[PDB]
Each structure stands twice: as structure tokens, then as C-alpha cells.
Subunit: 145 residues, 6 copies
């Protein structure tokens, strides 16, 4: 079946500085989703201005390292957006990453993709194809029909 | 007061294989609900065809053991359904068992009852009356008016 | 910026007896909110009849100690109400304090303020101005734009 | 390989009343051990006097229900004793069930077996052979050489 | 029985700034111990020089607020020291507060008393007798013989 | 001060398949240690035979992906070994990664370095110097004297 959908989930640098890394990675791991690539990176002037295809928002993203990850699994993009919660923390629900950890729209802990098309372009910017792993998750057989 | 409502909450065998047992039992324990019976059981051809009163769904349920439990407490049936979340994981909310751990409608980790009438028939199938314990939960006095 | 909003969050004595203290304080701590004062107190006939500006509800509140706290941060009042969840536990959602731990409207584990005006009057009743601490939360710079 | 060792782990009725069930079952589940049977039971005058092969200790054990479980896996008996910690809570280490949750030798939350011989006799008393499930844990292949 | 022993457990200001409050309070709550008083306080030149009955250590303790608490229960002082772990984090064991959260002897997250005599003098300095609550913990009957 | 010590902590492929990633990364994050690089990688015949400077142990390490990480902080190497616990799971203590999650010497969930010299050589094999990030951890000032 086509359960090879992959979204891009990155922990913004507030996230990272605040210590929320392992915590955020939980919600994905335990849902049954598949970590497929991951790196820590200080964002580039280029890398960035190409991403967000706000003069102050720039040097925020540069101001810390960023945990860039990629997660494979069915409906992972929408489920990702779900797990993160409303983009403005002040209206995302508890249980979600934004609603558990965030307050400011501007410091909203992480980013996820909003479309299969969004994700795919986003991943290929942030990672080369060599960098991405595929294995079968042992749990696959029990996770999916 | 009539706070003797009892629902049937079973961890389907994905649940069990996936390691989600103690985890699922938390959400009930800590809500204040009362474990009242529990067993691990490999489901029967009979036991099953009588339960679900899909040719492939059968041998799924047989394919692992099942944690059958019974939980007493006020509005426990509806609260159970609430705690488990939407039956299709892809639209149940985070904070719920299905939304935290599940992806596939077909592998949706556990089952709960949908009616007082559902539960009561369900329990009496899955357990004999001798097997069910009653004690007073120490916490009762602080849980309820 | 005016992110000095402060709500009053108290753990009712069910909360306290039931062991939910550290647990409830988590949801606030980890959201990024700032503990600003805290005490354990057995509620007064006076202190109370002035608060709730039900003959049985009185001696409930007297029947255990109460954890009174104050939390500073942006939109903290509404976010507090959000974190606690619907006041009737039987309709508050999982992920919230009431939906995770509560069943009875009458034993709903904690109280939070419903207005900036509510909170401010509530705090000044429950604490003197000397008792309240201000420090800058180290995490402030990463929590807020 | 002979990784079919099984110990008996029961949550004493303090444990149960105190809400420690799911919590205790975690430490076993997540270690990789295999739940193999489980029931809730109010202890019998007979069942008991045969177990502990103290006049006040009797009616303690009768005073609540007991969660009896059986767990399969390599070196499970000794690892069980390890996870529970020193039998006197006041000298068991944190990280263990007794050191995390217990204070009184007399209220030490749970019991585990001390020998393969202890366990086997203990299980056959507490359960019939029909009641015990075997399945292969999906995780087995990744847990063991 | 004399299970009225009380130790003083304070979260140093690293602890507080670092977000470890609720977390630290867990280990005590869930062990079965009784919160008996608590306040947030910026430490005094006087209050301090009287406590520690190092010129740089002074203005560290002043540099944040401090969570002062008092906890009642049997052998609570020694069990407190146990839960905190070795005073130098680099040799305290995991499972303890210092071994889970700490690295530097100088930033060792919290303080606990080392003697019944230590504690009692320490509490009376840090709190007045009015400020301390006694209630019976509901769980007492299940915690103690 | 020289608190720039860095150890290599990798989650072996049991770890990864078993879902222990976020979980393992916690113990490091929350201790105050600094993630400094991270990648997911399927191990190479070359990369490996050069690492372990057992014919069956080879194709085990190849049989899944591996989470390679690097963590900076004082005494991080020894504290790493501490957090992981005894290399044989059957004698590591609870609270440690090996004692919480592991049973078999051969499937012991993760690897850590045993020396500053071990680590440094290990990191330079597993990562290029470009791949490693340095930022100051916001929490540094509160973590260290």
C-alpha cells in the first residue's frame, strides 16, 4: 500500500534551546511513524530565503540550531499538522506540541509541512536523497492492515 | 449514587504486540476509574462470531492475545469512548489513545463499548460473574460528591 | 511587551489528596509559564465566603488543604482555563487536567480564573503583594518575540 | 533458546488502591518482558495460608483486591526482583518500584518471586494452566540474539 | 506511630530557572510523602548568612527565586537525601534528581536536609509555624502499617 | 571552562526498531547535555570493520538503521556510560537505559564511548567536522558555575 508519505518536521530553534527535542520526537515515534532522516543544522542565508519562498524573522531562524527531520507513514503530513496543533499556540489544543509547550505565534517551537507537495520540495531542499534511510519498521505489520 | 456503570475496554492485539498495555491502562487508572476485572486471552472462533453479532478481520483478532478489561465508574462508557477517541485514528484527536498511538482504522489499538447495553452484554460474554471484583476504591470519597 | 498577565490556579483539595499536585504544576511549568507565588493553605470561613462572592460545598473546601498558585505570562488566564478544560469533567477533553483526572463537576480537581479582573481580585485575596516574586524566566527570551 | 523463564509479579492491595497498577506494569512491558496472564482477585483464606507456606498480615492481604500477573522472558525472575527493588522500601533504590512508590516494609506495593522454583509453584497456585497465554512477542526478534 | 518526621526540600534557583519544579515535586508526591508547606522566595542576605551557618556562592543563591518546601512522612529526611542523590551530580546515580538533571556540584538543582536536627532548625528559619499545614493524607492508611 | 567534552552516543538498531529513540535522547537532553550532531544511517561494511577495530555481530549492525549522535558537556563521556548503565543489561541498574529497556548483552539497545580518546576517534569516523554544530545552550549559564 502507499503508506510512504513523508512529511518534514523541524524543531525551530526555540524548540531546540528550550530542551523540547526528545519530547517532540516522542509524539512521532510512539504514533508509529518512521524516522527516515534527521540532522542538526544552523540555517543558511541561502537555505532560508529559498525555503520561505518579516526582516526580523530571518535572524531568528539563524539565531539557534534547527532539528530537521523526516517522517514516513500514512497520512503523515496531515497527522503531523494535527500533532503539532494550530500554528498560533494561543489557539492550539492541549495534547498537541504547540498547545503543550508554546505561547507566541512567533515562537511556536516547530514547523511541519502543509501539503504532500509542500513536504517533498521541503525535504529535497533540507536533505540530499543519499541522506534518507529506508528500512522496514518492525512494527509495520501491526500498525497497518 | 449510581456510579456503578461499567464499560468493557479491550486492548486489541495490535495494542498488545505493540507494547501499549500499561500505557492504555494508565489513562483509565489515573482518571479515577476502577479496574474490576482483567484477563489476557487468545480469542475463540465462537467467542468472536458471537461478539461481532470482513472475512479477514476474523483471523486478525485471532492473530494475537487480547487484553480484556472491565472498568467501573460514573459515565465510564461514554468517558471510555472519549479517552479512546474517534474510531478511525486518522481523525481522532491527540490526547486520546487512538490519536496518540494509531494510524489505521483496521489497527486501532483497542475497543471500548458504545452503550451501557453494549457493555453489559459484552462483559458477560467475555467474563463470568465470579471473575469480577468489587472493592471500594480508596479514592472514591475524593473523586465523587 | 505586556506579558505580565497573571492568573490564579488553585488545586482544590480533591486534587491535593489525590496526589495530583506535581502533575498539575507540570502543565504550567512546561508551557513556559512562570510560577510567581504558591502556598498550601487550609481555607478559612472568612477567606471563603469572600471568594465565592451550596451549603455543602463550603465544608468540602475546608475538608482538605488547598494548593493556591499564581502564574505569570501572556494570555495566561485564558490559557489556564484552556489547560484545565471544561469545568464539568464529563465534557472536558483529554489532554486537559479536568479530562485526564476528573469525573464529577463537584470534584473537579482544581480552579482557575475566568477573567483578568477575576484573577487580580482573586490573587489579592489569597496572597499579599509581598508574597509574590518577580524574576525573569531564563527561558523568556526563547519563549517570546 | 530457553528464554521461557516466568516469574510471578503481583501488585499487593496497597499498590492497587494507590493507583500504581499501570505504572508498575510499565516497567515490565517496556523492559521487553511478555505478559502471559493477569487477573484481579480478592485473596482467599485458603489461597493465602497456602501461599505464605503475622496474624495481622493475613487480613491486610484480604483487605483489597490483588493484581496477580505472570511475565515470561530471560532471567525474568531475577530481573523482576531487580525492578521491584529491595523488599524494605527504606533501603531500595530510586528507579525501582519499591523506591519510587513505597515507604513501609509492611506496605511495599508489590510482590515478586525469589526463585524459578518459587515462581513456578506460585503461578500454579494463583492460575490454572489454561489461563496462561503464549504468543510470540513481535519484539522478540529485536530483543534477543 | 511517629511518622511525622519532616525534612526541608528546596529547589535551588538553577532548578527553578531550568523548569524542574513540578518534576522534582513528583518524586516526593508519588513516593507517598506529604506536602506540608511550600513558598517561592527570593533569598535574603540575612536569611542566607544564617542558613549556611564561597563569597560567590552567596549571590548565586540570590540570583533567582527559590522553591522552599516541607515534606512530612517516615524516614523522610534520609529518603529525601536518597531521592536527591549524591550531592556532587557527577557521582549521583540515575533515578535520582541530581543524577537525572545535574552536572555541576555548584549547580546541583536542589537542597535537602541531612539530619532531623538539620531539617527542624532549617524549616523554622525558612517558615513560621502558622505557615505549615497538617491534614491527614487520604493515602496514609494504605501507605503505612 | 573546559566543558566541551563530547561523547558519541548511538542507538543500536534494536533500539531504533524498538521505538526507543526519543526516549533515549531524553535522558541526555534533560540532564543538560547539548546535542551537537545527529544522523540516521545504515551501517557500511567499511564504516563498521573500522569501528570495531563475532562474524554474526556484523550483519546485526547492518540489519537496521542506526541513530548516531554526538553530545557535548562536562564529564559527558563518563556520564554517558553512567546513563546507559552496565553493558550487560542483566546487571545494569534500573534508571539506566540498559536496565529500563534491555535484556540481552547482544541486544543492548545503544552504544556509548568509553574514553575521551575513544569518543573523539569514534565521532570523526561517524561524522565530518562540517556536520557538527556549536551554539551556546541557553541553559548553560544555569547548568554550570
Amino acid at each position: 500500500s502507499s503508506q510512504t508519505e513523508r512529511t518534514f518536521i523541524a524543531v525551530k530553534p526555540d524548540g531546540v534551546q528550550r530542551g523540547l527535542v526528545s519530547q517532540i520526537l516522542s509524539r512521532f515515534e510512539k504514533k508509529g511513524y518512521k524516522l527516515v532522516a534527521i540532522k542538526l543544522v544552523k540555517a543558511d542565508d541561502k537555505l532560508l530565503e529559498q525555503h520561505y519562498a518579516f526582516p526580523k524573522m530571518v535572524s531568528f531562524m539563524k539565531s539557534g540550531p534547527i532539528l530537521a527531520t523526516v517522517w514516513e507513514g500514512k497520512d503523515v503530513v496531515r497527522q503531523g499538522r494535527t500533532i503539532l496543533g494550530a500554528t498560533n499556540p494561543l489557539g492550539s489544543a492541549p495534547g498537541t506540541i504547540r498547545g503543550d509547550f508554546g505561547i507566541d505565534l512567533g515562537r511556536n517551537v516547530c514547523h511541519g509541512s502543509d501539503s504532500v507537495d509542500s513536504a517533498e520540495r521541503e525535504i529535497n531542499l533540507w536533505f540530499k536523497k543519499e541522506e534518507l534511510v529506508d528500512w522496514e519498521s518492525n512494527q509495520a505489520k501491526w500498525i497497518y492492515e
